[PDB]
């Protein structure tokens, strides 16, 4: 316990930069889902002025 | 039974205005009847057995064989009427050298034969009405040496009609017993 | 180990019996049936050697009609089977069924059962009666049973947890000619009461708390919970503990003003205890408003005497005394010359517990108060005022001289109440 | 089993000797071994809906309030 | 495609009656009509009647049957007279007042008769060259009470109405002056309330059963009692169920359960046979010699008339069904949970396989653990249990639960948590253990009801889908809260998207709406079917199915990221309330609120 207690503050960071990351990947990735869908408001308009 | 109930000066047994007064005794008819009618001198119901044989119709007050009844009280007191027929009851008793004796009080004898088990013993009620007072802690002093623990069963054979079959821990006079326990 | 012994008398004392005896079970680890799964309950349940648990309390009524609730509810195999004394006819709003020719039948069970019970407790410390003002049997049956348990055994304290008739609302008629005849019993064979009344506690349940429809099975909750405060110390562990005497020395200064108020501090939901800091300061400025009383009168018309607290959880002494030397500082709270100390503390290591399906949150401090104070001489004389326009034209009285009571103890205890009143105010004035 | 003739005798000899009458010897010793859907539960007590307790449901579906009883002195009065 | 049904109605009187080729036998259900074969094959359910059918009943020569059914009061109610060849409605008959207590066919196919109103009673008469009526009367005695029943005669003219509170009255009907004309049959001192009826073959004497328990006999020629019923034995509740015979035996039967042979001066049991649950249906079938009972719980029995031995042949529940849950990994297996009742099934056969009750309470959801362990259900008398797989005991219950019913429960995947949300709102989780099962922490965000709590498939968070307009996600290692769902519906179902991207939500206002896992953002919303209700979805392991059941006929099969709709919804209107798939991906199998479990095969969306 004592020898690990040395790097008490970079698993505290390190654990906030993941879930950081992995939230807004999944926002990424469902972003790609919504853009792929084709019955989308914005997408109709796209395709009426194409 | 009647281990943890209280055992204070009057305890009861069987009174006949009741929605079941027989719910704890058990009862062997054979050769007779038992009912509730109405007697036509205290004006109020009794119980009715009767029967051509003495020894086969019986109520017994512990229902179950092997279960006894345990009261400490010193005085068995009945009410029963005369019918000039033959009637007989029965008790047993526990003593403190831890047996079991008894004592019957049958109509028709005239030698009470002091036993190791069974001392039998005669009776003779009055023309009427009468109730009976029994008085088991001298019966057991004087006829077997030893004296009064327990009483553990009770049993009434043939020809009686039955009221109000009570434990005392005196003898009360008819002033002193309260109003319910009177006769009439 | 350091025993109680709870009788609870009619049938308003048995119904808030049956909601004081599952936050006993919930408090230490014992199930309903009385097994214990996994000596701090030594007070309340003795223990059998087949890992049973019996309780310290007798419930009596003479009628069989709510017994008969509890004898095949969910707490059946937990009583004794002669904890449980019934009849077959009550008392019908009248003292003198009760406390006179029906009612002296079922004393001997109740004073077997009393012996039996406080012949097995190795160290026995009072006694936790909970009768109702109100009742033909809750308020005979007990005056006929403590008139005689003083002779058996005397010196030990009387503790009374009574349901007090509240000024606007009641449920009977003849509550003036029932409430007035038991205080010839609890003045001189009794050592303190605590009343409590059903107005306020709707009161203080529907505007701290969001019930609409409140209920008995919501009052019966909060006064067992004062209870289980009140009985904090004989069972648990702190910095400060006060004993069934070390308060109830405290609290009779004079031997005819033994009728203190009760108030028990936290009473919040489960929504809104999140926005409140729940401090004790404030929890302790809580307790000295007019508005949670749980007894209808306001104490700042009057005086406070002398008072007690009850504390527990999660406090530590420093403020405490912050806390009560503001108290001593305000205005709104006034005493009297002959008490100018007129605080007690005691403290305790636990935190309240929450019963299931209780609208009450896990606080974590706690506070009971219990005062003697002289302005429950105006809930008395609102009462006082009930007696004598139904005497002067002697309405109901042949119901009470037909089951053996005679006229004139309707003048004795008036002019008993009348020299109890009187005493009041001779102790309020200054000197 | 039977380890002697005693035993073969009494160890099933299947004979009263007080209700067994003028016998013979073979009608004395005769041992035994010569003569020879849908499924349901049921909750034990019966229970009633009238004697519940967890709550006392408001006349008006409140969720929607029917006939507005407000908080005394401001605010939501239910759930 | 459509197959195995399953369920019954035997609720309302004389519901079974097999058509004399004696092959079909027809019954209703909750909103229509259903005719089995000998092979099971469905068909036809015959569509309408806005609402509950009520009475059935059959002419004689086996082309025409005839439901009436129940409104609101002040509401018409509709006979419709349909066919036995090509299964079309001929005639909608709607001229009553609140709904049609009682039909009957003439053994010459032109006349039908009909009682109608609980409160406005009367009897008007059909004919069936023109759907229209030829005259009515108000067939219930002013100063004596209401009717129930009526039967024609085979005089062709002539039809009784029947004591509801004991009036008797025979009308006689004679087309000219166009008139059906009261007398009634004078009793002496007798006054019961009659039950049942049936008439003879030579129409010599008519048998009433009572609900005191006597099987009287009556003489429609002298207008006058003719017999008395049993002393000694009457039998135990009302008469509910008397047939005839050819012969003159007539077949007795008593709402509580009892079946007896009886004969007409001496009305003594020949032949008894205890059944189960009351009857309230016999049906003969014409070759005579095998016949069926119809009772109260929805069991047909098959029971032959030689030797009286009988073969229940169909079961179901008797309430509003809700909740059904598959095991995960076995698709054989069905639990159905409903009002004082919790069945398990089969899926295949289905056969029943076991049966646990509740006295009289309520149940609310069923669920499984993620083992076969146990069965945890919810119920509203404040109680949560849980009972054995086999054997239905009693493992454990939870005292004093919510202050209301607990309505929606859900099982941890670990088999140690288990989260409870019910009417009042203080979402609670029970922590279970071999010993004892405690209470950690109750959550009080929501304001109104709960209606379903579905939990993450690796536990960390859950969802309840609740009828306030805030479906929450809490989080389940810490117990605070994340994400609030605030819409515009009263939510019925919100279901997981596998591979746990987001969360979609139905309910009452018909919007599927796909919900983005992350500040309960809307992303689409498409429509119901129309002006219905929506109150059970499904996805399937992979995630590209999905389907939806609800408040109209309807199921409907649709595409994940599309909307694709797949109707093959032509089952039964009685609300759908609950819907999952088979864990194989075989079977989609619903629940229809008035008791009728349906499954279809596995569509390709």
């Given at each position: ?21 992995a939230?807004?990947?999944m ?10 869908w ?13 | 039974?009647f ?32 009912k ?24 017994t ?11 400490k ?18 008790v ?10 008894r004592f ?15 001392c039998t ?6 023309d ?9 802690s ?16 009770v ?9 109000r079959?009570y ?10 017993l ?7 | ?5 709870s ?7 048995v ?12 408090e230490?680890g ?17 223990e ?34 002669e ?5 077959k ?31 097995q ?6 006694f ?11 308020s ?6 403590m ?11 009387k ?9 606007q609302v ?7 000619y ?14 303190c009461?605590?009343m ?10 529907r ?7 409140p209920t ?43 009728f ?8 919040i ?10 401090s004790?300061?404030?929890i302790?400025?809580?307790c000295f408003?007019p ?11 009057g ?8 504390y527990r ?17 305000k205005?709104?709270?006034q ?9 007690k503390?005691?403290?305790?290591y ?47 009285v ?5 089951e053996?009571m005679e006229?004139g ?8 109440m009348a020299a ?12 | ?32 071994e ?18 519940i ?27 | ?10 609720h309302?009187?004389?519901g ?24 099971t ?12 059918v009520?009475?059935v009943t ?9 439901s009436?059914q ?13 066919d036995?060849?090509?299964?079309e409605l001929?005639a ?17 196919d ?12 009367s ?18 005695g ?5 009717a129930?029943?009526?039967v ?7 039809m ?51 609900t ?22 009457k ?6 169920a008397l ?17 007896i ?12 046979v ?5 009857i309230?249906?016999?049906t ?13 719980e ?6 032959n ?47 029943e ?5 509740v ?11 993620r083992d ?15 009972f ?5 005991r ?33 979402v ?30 690796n ?9 306030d ?32 991207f ?17 500040d309960?953002?809307?992303i ?6 129309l ?22 006929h ?11 709709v ?40």
């Amino acid at each position: 316990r004592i020898r690990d207690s040395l790097n008490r503050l970079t698993r505290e960071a390190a654990v906030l930069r993941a879930e950081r990351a992995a939230k807004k990947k999944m926002h990424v990735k469902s972003q790609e889902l919504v853009k792929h869908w084709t019955n989308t408001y914005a997408g109709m308009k796209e395709q009426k002025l194409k | 039974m009647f281990k943890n109930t209280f055992q204070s000066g009057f305890l009861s047994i069987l009174y006949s205005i009741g929605s079941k007064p027989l719910q704890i005794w058990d009862k062997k008819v054979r050769n007779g009847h038992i009912k509730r009618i109405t007697d036509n001198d205290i004006q109020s119901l009794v119980l009715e057995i009767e029967g051509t044989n003495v020894s086969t119709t019986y109520i017994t007050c512990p229902a179950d064989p092997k279960k006894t009844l345990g009261i400490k009280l010193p005085f068995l007191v009945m009410i029963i009427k005369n019918l000039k027929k033959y009637f007989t009851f029965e008790v047993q008793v526990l003593d403190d050298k831890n047996v079991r004796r008894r004592f019957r009080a049958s109509n028709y004898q005239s030698t009470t034969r002091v036993k190791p088990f069974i001392c039998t013993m005669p009776m003779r009620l009055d023309d009427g009405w009468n109730q009976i007072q029994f008085n088991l802690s001298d019966f057991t002093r004087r006829a077997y040496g030893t004296n009064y623990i327990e009483t553990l069963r009770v049993q009434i054979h043939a020809n009686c009609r039955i009221r109000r079959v009570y434990f005392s821990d005196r003898l009360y006079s008819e002033d002193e017993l309260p109003a319910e326990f009177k006769l009439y | 180990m350091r025993e109680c012994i709870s009788i609870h008398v009619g049938q308003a004392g048995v119904q808030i019996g049956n909601a004081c005896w599952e936050l006993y079970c919930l408090e230490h680890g014992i199930q309903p049936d009385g097994q214990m799964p996994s000596d701090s309950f030594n007070t309340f349940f003795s223990e059998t050697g087949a890992g049973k648990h019996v309780p310290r309390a007798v419930f009596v009524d003479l009628e069989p009609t709510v017994i008969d609730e509890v004898r095949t509810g969910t707490y059946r195999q937990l009583f004794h089977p002669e904890q449980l004394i019934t009849g077959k006819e009550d008392a019908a709003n009248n003292y003198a069924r009760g406390h006179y020719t029906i009612g002296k039948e079922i004393i001997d069970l109740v004073l077997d059962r009393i012996r039996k019970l406080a012949d097995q407790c190795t160290g026995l410390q009072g006694f936790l009666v909970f009768h109702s003002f109100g009742g033909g049997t809750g308020s005979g049956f007990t005056s006929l049973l403590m008139e005689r348990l003083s002779v058996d055994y005397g010196k030990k304290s009387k503790l009374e947890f009574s349901i007090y008739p509240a000024p606007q609302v009641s449920t009977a008629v003849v509550e003036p000619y029932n409430s007035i005849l038991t205080t010839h019993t609890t003045l001189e064979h009794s050592d303190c009461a605590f009343m409590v009344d059903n107005e306020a506690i709707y009161d203080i349940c529907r505007r701290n708390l969001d019930i609409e429809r409140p209920t008995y099975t919501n009052l019966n909750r909060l006064i067992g919970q004062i209870v289980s405060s009140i009985t904090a110390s004989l069972r648990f562990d702190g910095a400060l503990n006060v004993d069934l005497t070390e308060f109830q020395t405290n609290l009779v200064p004079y031997p005819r003003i033994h009728f203190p108020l009760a108030t028990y501090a936290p009473v919040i939901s489960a929504e809104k205890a999140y926005h409140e800091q729940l401090s004790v300061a404030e929890i302790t400025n809580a307790c000295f408003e007019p508005a949670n009383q749980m007894v209808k009168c306001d104490p700042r018309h009057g005086k406070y005497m002398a008072c007690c607290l009850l504390y527990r959880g999660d406090v530590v002494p420093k403020d405490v005394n912050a806390a009560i030397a503001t108290i001593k500082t305000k205005r709104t709270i006034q005493f009297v010359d002959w008490c100018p100390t007129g605080f007690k503390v005691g403290i305790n290591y636990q935190p309240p517990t929450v019963v299931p399906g209780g609208d009450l949150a896990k606080v974590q401090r706690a506070v009971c108060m219990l005062s003697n104070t002289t302005a429950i001489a105006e809930a008395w004389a609102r009462l006082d005022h009930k007696f004598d326009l139904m005497y002067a034209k002697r309405a109901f009285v042949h119901w009470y001289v037909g089951e053996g009571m005679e006229e004139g103890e309707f003048s004795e205890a008036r002019e008993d109440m009348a020299a109890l009143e009187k005493d009041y105010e001779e102790v309020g004035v200054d000197s | 089993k039977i380890p002697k003739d005693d035993l073969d005798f009494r160890l099933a000899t299947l004979y009263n000797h007080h209700t067994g009458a003028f016998k013979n010897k073979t009608e004395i010793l005769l041992h035994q071994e010569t003569i020879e859907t849908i499924r349901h539960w049921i909750n034990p007590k019966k229970e009633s809906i009238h004697s519940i307790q967890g709550s006392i449901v408001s006349p008006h579906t409140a969720a929607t309030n029917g006939g507005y009883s407000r908080k005394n002195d401001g605010g939501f009065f239910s759930t | 495609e459509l197959q195995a049904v399953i369920g019954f109605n035997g609720h309302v009187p004389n519901g079974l009656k097999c058509h004399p080729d004696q092959e079909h036998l027809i019954y209703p259900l909750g909103c229509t009509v259903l005719i089995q074969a000998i092979n099971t094959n469905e068909q036809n359910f015959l569509h309408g009647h806005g609402n509950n059918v009520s009475c059935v009943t059959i002419s004689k020569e086996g082309d025409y049957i005839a439901s009436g059914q129940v409104t609101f009061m002040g509401f018409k109610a509709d006979i419709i007279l349909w066919d036995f060849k090509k299964r079309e409605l001929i005639a909608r008959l709607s001229l009553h007042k609140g709904k049609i207590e009682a039909l009957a066919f003439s053994p010459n196919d032109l006349y039908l008769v009909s009682l109608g109103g609980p409160d406005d009673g009367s009897v008007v008469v059909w004919s069936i060259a023109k759907r229209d009526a030829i005259c009515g009367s108000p067939a219930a005695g002013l100063n004596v009470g209401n009717a129930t029943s009526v039967v024609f005669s085979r005089c062709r003219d002539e039809m009784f109405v029947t004591a509801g509170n004991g009036t008797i009255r025979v009308w006689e009907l004679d087309l000219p002056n166009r008139k059906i004309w009261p007398t009634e049959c004078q009793t002496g001192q007798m006054k019961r309330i009659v039950l049942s009826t049936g008439m003879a073959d030579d129409d010599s004497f008519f048998y009433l059963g009572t609900t005191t328990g006597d099987i009287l006999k009556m003489n429609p020629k002298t207008k006058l009692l003719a017999d008395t019923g049993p002393v000694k034995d009457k039998f135990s509740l009302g008469v509910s169920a008397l047939r005839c015979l050819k012969m003159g035996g007539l077949l007795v039967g008593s709402g509580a359960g009892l079946l007896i042979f009886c004969k007409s001066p001496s009305y003594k049991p020949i032949k008894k046979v205890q059944l189960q649950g009351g009857i309230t249906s016999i049906t003969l079938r014409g070759e005579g010699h095998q016949f069926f009972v119809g009772t109260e719980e929805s069991h047909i029995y098959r029971v032959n008339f030689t030797d009286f031995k009988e073969t229940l042949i169909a079961t179901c529940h008797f309430e509003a069904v809700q909740d059904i849950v598959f095991p995960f990994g076995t698709a054989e297996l069905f639990a159905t949970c409903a009002k004082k009742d919790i069945r398990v099934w089969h899926t295949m056969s289905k056969r029943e396989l076991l049966r646990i009750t509740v006295p009289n309470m309520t149940c609310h959801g069923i669920d499984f653990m993620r083992d076969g362990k146990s069965i945890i259900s919810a119920w509203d008398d404040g109680k949560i249990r849980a009972f054995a797989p086999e054997s239905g005991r009693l493992m454990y219950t939870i005292n004093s639960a919510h202050r209301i019913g607990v309505t929606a429960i859900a099982t941890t995947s670990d088999c140690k948590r288990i989260i409870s949300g019910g009417g009042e709102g203080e979402v609670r989780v029970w922590q279970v253990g071999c010993q004892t099962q405690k209470l950690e922490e109750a959550l009080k965000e929501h304001k109104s009801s709960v209606s379903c709590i579905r939990v993450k498939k690796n536990n960390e968070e859950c969802v309840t889908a609740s009828t306030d307009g805030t479906c929450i996600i809490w989080d389940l290692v810490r117990l605070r809260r994340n994400q609030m769902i605030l819409a515009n519906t009263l939510f019925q179902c919100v279901c997981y998207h596998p591979e746990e991207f987001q969360i979609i939500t139905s309910g009452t206002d018909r919007k599927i709406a796909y919900w983005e896992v992350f500040d309960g953002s809307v992303i689409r919303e498409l429509e119901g079917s129309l002006s219905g209700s929506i109150n059970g979805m499904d996805i399937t392991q992979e995630g590209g199915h999905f389907v939806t059941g609800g408040h109209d006929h309807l199921v409907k099969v649709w595409d994940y990221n599309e909307g694709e709709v797949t109707h093959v919804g032509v089952g039964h209107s009685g609300n759908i309330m609950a819907m999952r798939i088979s864990p194989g991906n075989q079977y989609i199998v619903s629940v229809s609120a008035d008791g009728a479990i349906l499954r279809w095969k596995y569509p390709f969306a």
